[PDB]
Design a protein around this ligand. Sequence first.
Ligand SMILES: O=c1ccn([C@@H]2O[C@H](COP(=O)(O)OP(=O)(O)OP(=O)(O)O)[C@@H](O)[C@H]2O)c(=O)[nH]1
Ligand SMILES: Nc1ncnc2c1ncn2[C@@H]1O[C@H](CSCC[C@H](N)C(=O)O)[C@@H](O)[C@H]1O
Ligand code: SF4
Ligand SMILES: [Cl-]
Ligand SMILES: [Cl-]
Ligand SMILES: [Cl-]
Length: 290
Amino acid sequence: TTPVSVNYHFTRQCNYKCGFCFHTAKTSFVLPLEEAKRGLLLLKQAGLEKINFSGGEPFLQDRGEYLGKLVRFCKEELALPSVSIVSNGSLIRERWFKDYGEYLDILAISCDSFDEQVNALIGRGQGKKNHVENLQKLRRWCRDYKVAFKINSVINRFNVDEDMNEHIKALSPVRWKVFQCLLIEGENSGADALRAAERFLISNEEFETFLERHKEVSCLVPESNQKMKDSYLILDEYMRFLNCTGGRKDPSKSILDVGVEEAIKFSGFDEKMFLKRGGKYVWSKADLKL
Ligand SMILES: O=c1ccn([C@@H]2O[C@H](COP(=O)(O)OP(=O)(O)OP(=O)(O)O)[C@@H](O)[C@H]2O)c(=O)[nH]1
Ligand SMILES: Nc1ncnc2c1ncn2[C@@H]1O[C@H](CSCC[C@H](N)C(=O)O)[C@@H](O)[C@H]1O
Ligand code: SF4
Ligand SMILES: [Cl-]
Ligand SMILES: [Cl-]
Ligand SMILES: [Cl-]
């Protein structure tokens, strides 16, 4: 397995409380910046092309400077073709675009609804911000600072009937990921879990109904449970690969300890599904037309 596109969930801290969250606040561990950089260098030497920073909420650590420093390191020192972030968007300041936006290819913001009552039912924030305007503000900063803009949506019991066509098109993203809500034992299912996602789940038939309602959106990339569950390379906050084939998130040894080749043998990665879901795409902003 070559680690072509890898997600690094460097923190499990978060400031939201989405009821379905499948990457919960189980620890407060974050690698020292120098150790994270060492692990990223190991990934580059093993063939990394795209890194996505995630969590947790990645902008939390050191008030966004930890993430910015890693973004700049990957782009300028490792020369990675693609550096992306998935974020809930609650803590992103324009000063961060000024300091680090040059080095970021893609900013994904998670947006599950354009209805305030639904976001309250989900747990996305506390309703203090105008969340539609906040999203538009982040989008226009991506325009100003030449970052490609992406949206991620989790389709669940409370938004499965929503029509998002005009809202998504008003944001003109390069990529709109539409995930079926996914159950993960030890995260949002079972006795050992901080969340209980069962009440959020929808059937495959309901998820496809949502997809068909949004056919007109050209940037839509759909991922049913089957397309999502084993189609990612996921590094946790210790830089261990998480294996999701067992319906849990079982960890390998750290790449910092045993190296990439040994650790990744236990990832459970299904590369055919990674390709089938559209995981490989034009992901360098210099090669896009923003
Ligand atoms: O079973 C899973 C699957 C996915 N995830 C996590 O959900 C998030 C999905 O978020 P994205 O699909 O946007 O990640 P990405 O940037 O790698 O996607 P591409 O645009 O490159 O196709 C990623 O951070 C992934 O690690 C899990 O935590 N568990
Ligand atoms: N149970 C679940 N099923 C499918 N996607 C989920 C999920 N729980 C969370 N996600 C999605 O996984 C991605 C990474 S979650 C952590 C990143 C950041 N805090 C954020 O919310 O964007 C987000 O797009 C989130 O909406
Ligand atoms: S899905 Fe929600 S609770 Fe989970 S890490 Fe992202 S913003 Fe936080
Ligand atoms: Cl190299
Ligand atoms: Cl809020
Ligand atoms: Cl799908």
